[PDB]
Amino acid sequence: TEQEDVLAKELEDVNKWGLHVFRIAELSGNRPLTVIMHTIFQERDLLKTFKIPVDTLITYLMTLEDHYHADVAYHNNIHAADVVQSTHVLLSTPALEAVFTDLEILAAIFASAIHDVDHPGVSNQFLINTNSELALMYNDSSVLENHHLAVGFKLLQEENCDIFQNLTKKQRQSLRKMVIDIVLATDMSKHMNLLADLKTMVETKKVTSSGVLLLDNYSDRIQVLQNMVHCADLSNPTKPLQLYRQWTDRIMEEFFRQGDRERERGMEISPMCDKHNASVEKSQVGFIDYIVHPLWETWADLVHPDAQDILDTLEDNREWYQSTIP
Amino acid sequence: EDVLAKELEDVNKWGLHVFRIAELSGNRPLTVIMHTIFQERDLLKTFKIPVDTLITYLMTLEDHYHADVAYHNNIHAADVVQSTHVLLSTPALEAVFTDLEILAAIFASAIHDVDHPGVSNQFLINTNSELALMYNDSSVLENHHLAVGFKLLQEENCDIFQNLTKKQRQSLRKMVIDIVLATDMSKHMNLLADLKTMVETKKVTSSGVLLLDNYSDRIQVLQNMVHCADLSNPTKPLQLYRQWTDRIMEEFFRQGDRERERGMEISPMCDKHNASVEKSQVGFIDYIVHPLWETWADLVHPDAQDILDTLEDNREWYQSTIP
Ligand SMILES: COc1cc2c(cc1OC)[C@H](Cc1c[nH]c3c(Cl)cccc13)N(C=O)CC2
Ligand SMILES: COc1cc2c(cc1OC)[C@H](Cc1c[nH]c3c(Cl)cccc13)N(C=O)CC2
Ligand SMILES: [Mg+2]
Ligand SMILES: [Mg+2]
Ligand SMILES: [Zn+2]
Ligand SMILES: [Zn+2]
């Protein structure tokens, strides 16, 4: 229980960007999603607010965590835990104080926890091009993200797993709609449109008497939560470098395994997936320049100046990867 | 037979005796009408479809329409197929659509309601059904019709697209998905709005033939075409229309009985103890069907005139049955 001692100390960092999430995964016996979600629910008093029985919460979290694949290098329970914790920090930004209801906060955190559950470690395009059962089920449209939702919600029906048992019917209906809207927005094929829309919101931003964002209709509220969880999902390059490099190692392993399957099938290999013609560093610089920095610069503008340190880390990490190329 | 062959000679006419064909074919209207249309359009030779594969697939697809559902069954599928087939021949749409596009619209029509349980998307969502859980409350039925229609191609000797090339299959699949998802009635208003916009910006030859240069406009027309076909019952000869009304009302009343037995709020038009069938048809025509078909008729002006005339006659008749 020295191990439990150290785990408890590490979970004291749950409100901090840069949590030692890989250490928590080891110290908790490969239960980072369970222990980080439980910590955040206690920190936000969500069990009391929503009358969630503790044993039900733990049972659901352990079953949800079990349905992430332990043999996928990137899209596994550690990624889920990281996106949950990152969403939890973004929800606490001063520019959003008292903006979201407890139900919206619960939706964003739950959506983050389930948002990649049962991910097979290959992309939507691979699933479509190989005529997979998932792509047949979902008509080639947000194939993975529709699946993550269906699994995350189906698991609430397992024994002693219904963590929403004491919500009203209107609360359950609202939560389900918001969770669906959020997880579907994590489909990377939606990124350009989602960013375009966020830029429009920044350009037309309204702030209250108190200085917080004014969001007075469902469309604006859900758009901010969609972009919040998308930013959390695309947060690896904004983390301290020792965390970022481990995430890069993991995504490259997953990509290379996909590319090996493409090469064996005689398919064209997807970008970044060819281990015999990879440039890992150039790929991260491009990822930051074309995707991650445009997104995070816009989020930082929305909540200015709250996210300045995050943006500074992203820019430093870009400079570091760039410097390894020449 | 023989009478069935005589009935099928009207395959190119609005008002085919589809119920008679259902009876004469041993409850195989979808198979015999699809087979007839693939011949009339030379689609088996154009796409190198083996006739036995075609028949095997059609019989399997038709088997996955429910025979105990009064409206959304194989006779409705056959009717929508044949209606699309006629609309594809609107003179104003001449030279617009490729043969792959024609194949996609016809195939989409055939599968567009397969495995329909006879209850609405809202019912499926509110009863927390397995389908709504699978599809995240979004176009629940239409996603399932697609998934079943395509999965059945994988049954033994059922792949009617086996000799399409790789790109053709991918393009057909995309178009079919885009068309069937557009048949979700919750999308009607947006679809009609886009049809109106196309009518306003419409470009035609000197003889009034539609010019549609981009895929977006062409798939919108195919979406509205199959939606018109899906909503064509009130434009058919009255003896046909009244049978479709009887069937949809039975299906609605059965859904309302389930909603009552479960203690749910009964859906509009679904309460057999508080129904006005005729007023509901007049409202359906006034608010949904006639705006849609008037816009279609403007897009193809004036080739839809006879269809629109029948719709207007039928509206007048149903109104006269209200005291
Ligand atoms: C640490 O490094 C990485 C992490 C991740 C990715 C790529 C990384 O490094 C190049 C890709 C991003 C992505 C793929 N397609 C996209 C489209 Cl189409 C739009 C936006 C983002 C993406 N991911 C999953 O595949 C998410 C995690
Ligand atoms: C013969 O008479 C009928 C036939 C049909 C319907 C209604 C009829 O008579 C009132 C409804 C129409 C419909 C239901 N919700 C809609 C929405 Cl939300 C928008 C547009 C149309 C609809 N259908 C399916 O349920 C299609 C067939
Ligand atoms: Mg994902
Ligand atoms: Mg339908
Ligand atoms: Zn993710
Ligand atoms: Zn239909």
The whole-angstrom separation of Cα B27 and Cα A56 is: 52
Elucidation method: X-ray
- Identity at B215, one-letter amino acid code: Y
Q: How far is CA B140 from CA B75, B76, B136, B214, in A?
A: 22, 19, 8, 29
Q: How far is CA B186 from CA A315, B232, B276, B277, in A?
A: 45, 17, 23, 22
- Identify which of A275, A282, A277 has the alpha carbon closest to the alpha carbon of residue A252: A275
What are the residues facing B204 on neighbouring strands?
B210
- Identity at A268, one-letter amino acid code: E
Name every residue whose Cβ is closer than 8 Å to that of residue B212 and which is 6 or more positions away in sequence.
Answer: B96, B218, B221
Among partner residues A140, A141, A180, which is closest to B137 by beta-carbon distance?
A180
Q: What is the resolution of this structure in A?
A: 1.5
The whole-angstrom separation of Cα A260 and Cα A264 is: 6
Residues of A identified as active-site: 75
User: Contact at 8 Å (CB) between B184 and B120?
Assistant: no
Q: How many CB atoms lie within 10 A of CB B86?
A: 18
Query: What H or E segment, with its residue span, contains residue A314?
Result: helix A308-323
Which phi and psi (to 5°) does residue A213 adopt? -60, 135
Tell me the nearest-neighbour CA distance from A136 into chain B, angstroms.
Answer: 6
Look up residue B153 and give its DSSP letter. Answer: G
> Residue B132's closest chain A neighbor by CA?
A150
Say whether B147 and A136 touch across the interface (CB within 8 A): yes
User: Residue B16 in 3-state DSSP?
Assistant: coil
Name every residue whose Cβ is closer than 8 Å to that of residue B263 and which is 6 or more positions away in sequence.
Answer: none
- Identity at B30, one-letter amino acid code: L
User: Contact at 8 Å (CB) between A284 and A238?
Assistant: no
The whole-angstrom separation of Cα A234 and Cα A288 is: 10
User: Contact at 8 Å (CB) between A241 and A231?
Assistant: no
Token pair for residue B127? 């009863």
Name every residue whose Cβ is closer than 8 Å to that of residue A179 and which is 6 or more positions away in sequence.
Answer: A107, A110, A111, A114, A149, A152, A153
The binding-site residues of ligand 1, defined as CB within 6 angstroms of any ligand atom, are A 123, 188-189, 191, 236, 247-248, 251, 272, 283-284, 287, 291
Instruction: Spell out the alpha helix ranges (H) of A185-216.
Output: 191-203
User: Contact at 8 Å (CB) between B196 and B295?
Assistant: yes
User: Residue B204 in 3-state DSSP?
Assistant: strand
- Identity at B253, one-letter amino acid code: F
Look up residue A305 and give its DSSP letter. Answer: T
User: Contact at 8 Å (CB) between B228 and B293?
Assistant: yes
Token pair for residue B95? 């030279």
The whole-angstrom separation of Cα A315 and Cα A293 is: 8
Instruction: Quickly tell me which residue has 């919600």 as its tokens.
Output: A153
- Identify which of B179, B219, B187 has the alpha carbon closest to the alpha carbon of residue B121: B187
The whole-angstrom separation of Cα B266 and Cα B260 is: 6
- Identify which of B14, B257, B78, B53 has the alpha carbon closest to the alpha carbon of residue B160: B53
For B242-308, give the DSSP string.
HHHHHHHHHHHHHHHHHHHHTTPPPPTT--TTS--HHHHHHHHIIIIIHHHHHHHHHHTTTTTHHHH
Widest CA span in chain A: 61
Q: Which of A82, A194, A198, A234 to mutate to test the pocket of ligand 1 (most atoms within 8 A of CB)?
A: A234
User: Contact at 8 Å (CB) between B54 and B111?
Assistant: no
- Identity at A287, one-letter amino acid code: F
The whole-angstrom separation of Cα B292 and Cα B135 is: 28
Sign, CA dihedral B45-B5-B27-B119, equals: positive
The whole-angstrom separation of Cα A118 and Cα A127 is: 14
Ion ligand 6 — residues with CB < 5 Å:
B 113, 230
Any chain A CB within 8 A of the CB of B155?
no
The whole-angstrom separation of Cα B134 and Cα A176 is: 13
Q: Give the count of domains, chain A.
A: 1
Say whether A137 and B133 touch across the interface (CB within 8 A): no
Which phi and psi (to 5°) does residue B267 adopt? -70, 155
Name every residue whose Cβ is closer than 8 Å to that of residue B108 and which is 6 or more positions away in sequence.
Answer: B175, B176, B179, B180, B226
**At how many degrees (to 10) do helices B74-87 and B99-111 cross?**
160
- Identify which of A280, A272, A281 has the alpha carbon closest to the alpha carbon of residue A321: A281
Token pair for residue B260? 């009552």
Whether the upstream peptide bond of residue A237 has omega within 30° of 0, thus cis, is no
Domain that holds residue B50: 1-323
Say whether B143 and A138 touch across the interface (CB within 8 A): yes
Among partner residues A138, A154, A177, which is closest to B133 by beta-carbon distance?
A154
